[PDB]
Write a protein that binds this ligand. Structure first.
Ligand code: NA
Ligand code: NA
Lengths: 181, 178
């Protein structure tokens, strides 16, 4: 059943060749979002895996992360805290930076939404280089949150996200894995 | 369901949404609802009970706060969730529509199909420009939308009337005065 749900999940994700630019494969989770079965099972499986873990908040990073972290928060019956692109959160924020191809950008979190003692699970769609999750984890930790787990629908191991998270004291968990080739 | 439990839940949902002066306008901040598990599950439970008889086959939410309410409702109804996004983020074939500030929204063309009864779900009806565009995207692909659903309605900004003279039933959990 679990093994079968995973294959059903993996086949609902479409692979787009030469996106964004040529010789690059893109895994489109939106084909999963429109398959009611695959989408519920993905949230069931992420929830169940963290039932025994004592999580008090889930953090998801804008925007595809919203689609997995928020339903996981709902299933665990805990609060959801969003990490956002700059200038969207209205209350007091802190900021972290992360690298893009051509520059740098920032993520923000509300300072009142995390505090000492919170046990935080990060949920996201995609572990690629891991730069956004690294920035997200530093946000959570600067506010005294404890983060040991990050959960992903898709893992791209050839980009070495996993070991970069391990270096930062995060154990990663993922549903499916895809090759870069 | 009891109409008086319902009224109690709606009040608790309204009391958990915080208010911010002169950001960005009176800013109504839905992030306080998001971090309150009881207010948040209750807002999803309410929206989705409202539409469980309606024969919905798809839920559409707009990036990014729309994702936070539209996807859980999709999940609660057992139907597909379809995101309407900012430019350049959707990977398959898209069509595009314009709304003012001006910018575009996009949706995958293979995700709406004629026959679809689509509920749009969003966090907040302000001026209603995103929703106008989102309905056009859907209608152009042969979907029926008659139904748009909101946590928060801000009528003084005029959203509700702008939706009417486009074909659309508005439903909001709560509203506030400007
Ligand atoms: Na804090
Ligand atoms: Na179509």
């Amino acid at each position: 059943k679990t093994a079968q749900q995973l294959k059903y999940i993996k086949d609902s994700i479409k692979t787009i060749p030469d996106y964004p630019k040529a010789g690059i494969l893109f895994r489109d989770v939106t084909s999963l979002l429109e398959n009611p079965k695959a989408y519920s099972a993905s949230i069931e499986l992420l929830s169940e895996h963290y039932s025994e873990s004592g999580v008090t908040k889930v953090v998801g990073t804008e925007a595809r992360g919203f689609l997995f972290g928020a339903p996981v928060a709902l299933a665990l019956g805990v609060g959801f805290v969003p990490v956002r692109k700059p200038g969207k959160l209205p209350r007091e924020t802190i900021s972290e930076s992360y690298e893009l191809e051509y520059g740098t950008d920032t993520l923000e979190i509300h300072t009142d939404s995390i505090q000492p003692g919170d046990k935080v699970l990060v949920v996201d769609d995609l572990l690629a280089t891991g730069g956004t999750i690294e920035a997200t984890v530093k946000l959570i930790r600067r506010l005294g949150g404890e983060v040991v787990h990050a959960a992903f629908i898709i893992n791209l191991p050839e980009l070495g996200g996993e070991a970069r998270l391990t270096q930062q004291g995060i154990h990663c968990y993922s549903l499916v894995s895809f090759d870069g080739h």
